[PDB]
Amino acid sequence: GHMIKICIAGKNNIAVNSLQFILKNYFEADQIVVIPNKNDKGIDSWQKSLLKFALDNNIKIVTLDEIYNIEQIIFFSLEFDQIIKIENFKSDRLFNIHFSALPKYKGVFTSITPILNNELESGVTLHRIDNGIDTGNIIDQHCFPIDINDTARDLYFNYLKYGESIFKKNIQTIINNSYKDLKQTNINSSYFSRKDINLVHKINFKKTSFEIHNQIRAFIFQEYQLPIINNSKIIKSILANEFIGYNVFEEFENYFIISGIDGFKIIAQKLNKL
Amino acid sequence: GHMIKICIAGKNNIAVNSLQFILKNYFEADQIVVIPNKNDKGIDSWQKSLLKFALDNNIKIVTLDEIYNIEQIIFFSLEFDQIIKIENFKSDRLFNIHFSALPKYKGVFTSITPILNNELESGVTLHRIDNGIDTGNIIDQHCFPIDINDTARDLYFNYLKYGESIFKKNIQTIINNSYKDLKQTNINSSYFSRKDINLVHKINFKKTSFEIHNQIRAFIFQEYQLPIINNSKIIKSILANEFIGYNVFEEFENYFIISGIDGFKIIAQKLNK
Numbered sequence: 001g002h003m004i005k006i007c008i009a010g011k012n013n014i015a016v017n018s019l020q021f022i023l024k025n026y027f028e029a030d031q032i033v034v035i036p037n038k039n040d041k042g043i044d045s046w047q048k049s050l051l052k053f054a055l056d057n058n059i060k061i062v063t064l065d066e067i068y069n070i071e072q073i074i075f076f077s078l079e080f081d082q083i084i085k086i087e088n089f090k091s092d093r094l095f096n097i098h099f100s101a102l103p104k105y106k107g108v109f110t111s112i113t114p115i116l117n118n119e120l121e122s123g124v125t126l127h128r129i130d131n132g133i134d135t136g137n138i139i140d141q142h143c144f145p146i147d148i149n150d151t152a153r154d155l156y157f158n159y160l161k162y163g164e165s166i167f168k169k170n171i172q173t174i175i176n177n178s179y180k181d182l183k184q185t186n187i188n189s190s191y192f193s194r195k196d197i198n199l200v201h202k203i204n205f206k207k208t209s210f211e212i213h214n215q216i217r218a219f220i221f222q223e224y225q226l227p228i229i230n231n232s233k234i235i236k237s238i239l240a241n242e243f244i245g246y247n248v249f250e251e252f253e254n255y256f257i258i259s260g261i262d263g264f265k266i267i268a269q270k271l272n273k274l
Numbered sequence: 275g276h277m278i279k280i281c282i283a284g285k286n287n288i289a290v291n292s293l294q295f296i297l298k299n300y301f302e303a304d305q306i307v308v309i310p311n312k313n314d315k316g317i318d319s320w321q322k323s324l325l326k327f328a329l330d331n332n333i334k335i336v337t338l339d340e341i342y343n344i345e346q347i348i349f350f351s352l353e354f355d356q357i358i359k360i361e362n363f364k365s366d367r368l369f370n371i372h373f374s375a376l377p378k379y380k381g382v383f384t385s386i387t388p389i390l391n392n393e394l395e396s397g398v399t400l401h402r403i404d405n406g407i408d409t410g411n412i413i414d415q416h417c418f419p420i421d422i423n424d425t426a427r428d429l430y431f432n433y434l435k436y437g438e439s440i441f442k443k444n445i446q447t448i449i450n451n452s453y454k455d456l457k458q459t460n461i462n463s464s465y466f467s468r469k470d471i472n473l474v475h476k477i478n479f480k481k482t483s484f485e486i487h488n489q490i491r492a493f494i495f496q497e498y499q500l501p502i503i504n505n506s507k508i509i510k511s512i513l514a515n516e517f518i519g520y521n522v523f524e525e526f527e528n529y530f531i532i533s534g535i536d537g538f539k540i541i542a543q544k545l546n547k
């Protein structure tokens with residue numbers, strides 16, 4: 001049966017680089033379809049455009065409706081924006097790479113939520129798609145550090161890097177259908193929705209230096225927003241082990257020096273610094 | 275030097291039982307003074323009164339002002355309610371047992387905050403008192419599990435048990451001034467104040483079963499409050515690994531059946547009243 005073997009649905013460098021990899025190594029253009037996200041305008045910007053790549057390489061753009069009845073298609077979500085209902089699909093080869101160490105941080109804004117909840121590590125997880133949000137059985141996972149001064153943007157670029165890597169690592173077993181999976185546990189499972197995160201974050205300074213630093217850097221992702229302290233945008237936060245006294249807060253031309261209830265030095269750099 | 279060797283400041287069975295231990299094993303009444311918390315009624319309630327125990331055993335009740343100038347006094351806070359300033363004291367022998375696994379969960383409501391933040395363990399920590407809140411150097415720590423269906427009350431009674439034990443384990447080295455300590459790390463340090471916690475918790479059901487369960491059980495401490503769902507108080511939450519479908523919520527006479535976005539079964543048992 002069908003001409004079409006695989007759909008890449010989603011966006012950004014992970015979708016494009018994964019598509020490029022399958023086109024290189026596994027499938028021809030006329031065996032592939034893509035479903036870009038709704039906001040993809042076909043322009044390479046701070047991320048590559050999946051729509052652009054498809055148009056440039058002669059790969060058909062489709063809707064979900066067009067692929068539901070396609071027997072045995074591999075459906076791969078790589079930052080895809082639409083919740084699927086699995087019973088729509090004839091095929092049960094439905095996979096996602098989620099940007100967290102599941103079962104933690106299901107849902108959205110995963111470059112923000114682990115930092116804001118004081119994690120020292122995150123991960124990428126390849127899993128089956130079921131009808132819930134990031135709830136399906138885990139196939140592989142790679143965990144990696146959130147370095148102490150990483151911003152949400154830095155973490156997102158690590159997700160793209162390690163996510164592309166885990167795709168390449170696992171795709172052969174998906175294609176031959178010999179992969180193994182395990183149910184997610186109930187314990188440690190967590191979830192955040194768009195509503196749970198106010199993107200204009202008001203910092204609670206009656207917190208430890210680690211928590212104040214995490215509140216700042218979790219919102220540093222300049223293409224979307226920067227945290228504002230005393231009507232200044234912040235581009236970087238640096239947390240030191242140096243004790244400087246409790247509850248320090250001082251504004252300078254290029255930065256703030258801050259400490260919380262445990263007195264460790266934070267330098268919050270203003271965007272205006274040359 | 276001074277007749278007075280030690281001050282026990284605080285409340286509840288950890289303070290009473292630790293005081294009893296030192297009276298039995300180390301110091302006579304005249305060597306000990308006590309500073310109860312402001313709210314000590316001088317009667318036993320669901321915990322024993324430190325004030326009553328001191329009075330019954332001929333131990334003087336004092337204020338901070340009366341102990342500042344006592345050379346070499348051991349000041350030991352066991353659930354004490356007043357922030358001290360270390361430069362007030364001649365002595366540098368100032369100690370506390372904090373009900374968390376420091377550096378995590380500095381501050382208050384520590385039977386609530388670890389559960390609410392999805393922890394699987396907590397601890398008790400013996401540390402030196404410095405001028406910040408639970409920030410001084412760590413002398414000893416004992417960590418222990420938060421079992422999956424434990425409530426804030428169950429957690430508190432574990433703090434009392436393990437806190438009393440860590441007192442007994444370390445007190446001789448404290449009296450002999452032979453203990454070792456280590457500064458707290460900056461990383462992992464967290465802190466909650468009274469304003470951070472609304473004790474009338476409104477549950478967010480757009481969460482995992484583990485999160486909805488933790489929101490419920492974090493506020494189960496019947497001496498103070500129980501969480502309310504549709505005008506029923508909840509006395510126990512039970513989380514299973516049985517999948518029952520996503521986003522279940524059904525009310526029955528004696529319990530609710532609930533699941534969150536990942537579909538695992540919670541039974542939230544109503545208080546029998």
Ligand SMILES: Cc1cn([C@H]2C[C@H](O)[C@@H](COP(=O)(O)OP(=O)(O)O[C@H]3O[C@H](C)[C@H](O)[C@H](NC=O)[C@H]3O)O2)c(=O)[nH]c1=O
Nearest residue numbers: 079080081097098099107108109110111112156199221224
């Ligand atoms: C939209 C937006 C994003 N960001 C940051 C944080 C967020 O983690 C990162 C990527 O944003 P995004 O592409 O909208 O993805 P999220 O991390 O919210 O991931 C969710 O949406 C994407 C499109 C997928 O549907 C993804 N699917 C699940 O596996 C879902 O978790 O940019 C902001 O800082 N501010 C913003 O306003």
Ligand SMILES: Cc1cn([C@H]2C[C@H](O)[C@@H](COP(=O)(O)OP(=O)(O)O[C@H]3O[C@H](C)[C@H](O)[C@H](NC=O)[C@H]3O)O2)c(=O)[nH]c1=O
Nearest residue numbers: 353354355371372373381382383384385386430473495498
């Ligand atoms: C007052 C109150 C308490 N509780 C619970 C949670 C709290 O962790 C537990 C014990 O309450 P608490 O005796 O006021 O102590 P906290 O855990 O707030 O500890 C703080 O206060 C005590 C008096 C000490 O100052 C303690 N000092 C530091 O080591 C501080 O952390 O009862 C309620 O559920 N509801 C309430 O209304």
Ligand SMILES: Nc1nc(=O)c2c([nH]1)NC[C@@H](CNc1ccc(C(=O)N[C@@H](CCC(=O)O)C(=O)O)cc1)N2C=O
Nearest residue numbers: 077080081082083084096108130131132133134193194
């Ligand atoms: N069934 C299914 N499960 C998945 O885990 C999944 C898919 N489909 N499709 C691709 C991607 C979709 N990821 C998402 C995640 C969240 C929202 C979302 O709209 N969240 C809303 C709440 C939605 C709701 O409550 O119904 C929000 O405001 O956060 C959309 C797509 N994904 C990958 O595996």
Ligand SMILES: Nc1nc(=O)c2c([nH]1)NC[C@@H](CNc1ccc(C(=O)N[C@@H](CCC(=O)O)C(=O)O)cc1)N2C=O
Nearest residue numbers: 351354355356357358370382404405406407408467468
């Ligand atoms: N200097 C000092 N450090 C301590 O760690 C300490 C003491 N004193 N004294 C005994 C106990 C006192 N613990 C506490 C903890 C918090 C509050 C309190 O009122 N917290 C307020 C915030 C106060 C503030 O911001 O200054 C709140 O609303 O949460 C009081 C006593 N304690 C044990 O080692």
Ligand SMILES: [Cl-]
Nearest residue numbers: 402404410411
């Ligand atoms: Cl110290």
